[PDB]
C-alpha cells in the first residue's frame, strides 16, 4: 500500500555483502586445498544465517506498492539479489567435487530452506520481484540442481 522498496533493498544489500565475503573465501579455500568439513561448514553456516535473517527481515516488512522509476526500483532489488544468488549457486555446485568433504549434502540441505524462505518472502513482499531473478538464473539454475538446492530452484519458478 506504500513503497517499502528501500527496506527490502537494505535487506538484500546486507545479504549480498555477506555473500561477497563467504563465497570468495570458499573459492580460495577450494583452490588452495584448504576446503574441509570445518572450513567449508563455517562459511556455509554464516551464509545460511544471512539468508535466514534476510528472509525474516523481508517477511516482517509490509507489502510494497513498488517503484519502477526511482532507486531502488523493483528491478534494482531483483538484479542485486540475482547476481548474489548466481554467486552462491555456482560455488555451491563447485564444492560438490571436494573429496575431503563428508557433509556436502547436509550443508546444502540446511542452506536450501533458508534460500527458499527468502524467495517466498521477497516475492510476497514485493509481488513478482522473483520473476526477473528467475530470468537471470535461466542457466545458473543448473548449479542449484547439481547442489541439490531443489527448494531454492523451485521457489524461483523453475519446473
Ligand atoms: Ca548432494
The 3-class SS string of the chain reads CECCHHHHHHHHHHHHHHHHHHHHHHHHHHHHCCCCHHHHHHHHHHHHHHHHHHHHHHHCCCCECCCCCCCCCHHHHHHHHHHHHHHHHHHHHHHHHCCCCCCHHHHHHHHHHHHHHHHHHHHHHCCCCHHHHHHHCCCCHHHHHHHCCHHHHHHHCCC
| 141 Rama class: left (phi>0) / alpha (psi -120 to 50) / beta | alpha
Distance 93 CA to ligand 1 centre (A): 9
Residue 154 CB partners (closer than 8 Å, separation 6+) = 116
Distance 118 CA to ligand 1 centre (A): 21
Residue 134 CB partners (closer than 8 Å, separation 6+) = 156, 157, 158
Distance 105 CA to ligand 1 centre (A): 4
How far apart are alpha carbons 42 and 157 in whole angstroms?
Answer: 30
Q: What residue has cell string 561477497?
A: 20
Integer distance in angstroms from the first to the last C-alpha of the chain? 31
Distance 146 CA to ligand 1 centre (A): 7
What resolution in Å is listed for this PDB structure?
A: 1.6
Q: What residue has cell string 535473517?
A: 53
How far apart are alpha carbons 60 and 133 in whole angstroms?
Answer: 21
Neighbours of 7 (CB within 10 A): 17
Distance 108 CA to ligand 1 centre (A): 7
How far apart are alpha carbons 53 and 99 in whole angstroms?
Answer: 31
Residue 150 CB partners (closer than 8 Å, separation 6+) = 112, 144
Distances (CA, A) of 109 to 56, 67, 114, 118, 135: 19, 35, 9, 15, 24
Amino acid at each position: 500500500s506504500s513503497n517499502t522498496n528501500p527496506a527490502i533493498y537494505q535487506a538484500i544489500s546486507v545479504l549480498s555483502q555477506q555473500i561477497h565475503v563467504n563465497i570468495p573465501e570458499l573459492n580460495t579455500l577450494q583452490a588452495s586445498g584448504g576446503a574441509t568439513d570445518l572450513t567449508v561448514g563455517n562459511e556455509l553456516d554464516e551464509l545460511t544465517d544471512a539468508f535466514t535473517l534476510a528472509a525474516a527481515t523481508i517477511a516482517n516488512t509490509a507489502v510494497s506498492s513498488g517503484d519502477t522509476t526511482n532507486f531502488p526500483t523493483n528491478d534494482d532489488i531483483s538484479i542485486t539479489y540475482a547476481v548474489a544468488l548466481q554467486l552462491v549457486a555456482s560455488t555451491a555446485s563447485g564444492l560438490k567435487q571436494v573429496n575431503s568433504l563428508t557433509t556436502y549434502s547436509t550443508m546444502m540441505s540446511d542452506l536450501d530452506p533458508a534460500i527458499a524462505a527468502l524467495h517466498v518472502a521477497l516475492n510476497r513482499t514485493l509481488p513478482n520481484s522473483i520473476n526477473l531473478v528467475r530470468v537471470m538464473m535461466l542457466d545458473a539454475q543448473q548449479f542449484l540442481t547439481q547442489a541439490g538446492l531443489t527448494q531454492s530452484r523451485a521457489s524461483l519458478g523453475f519446473a
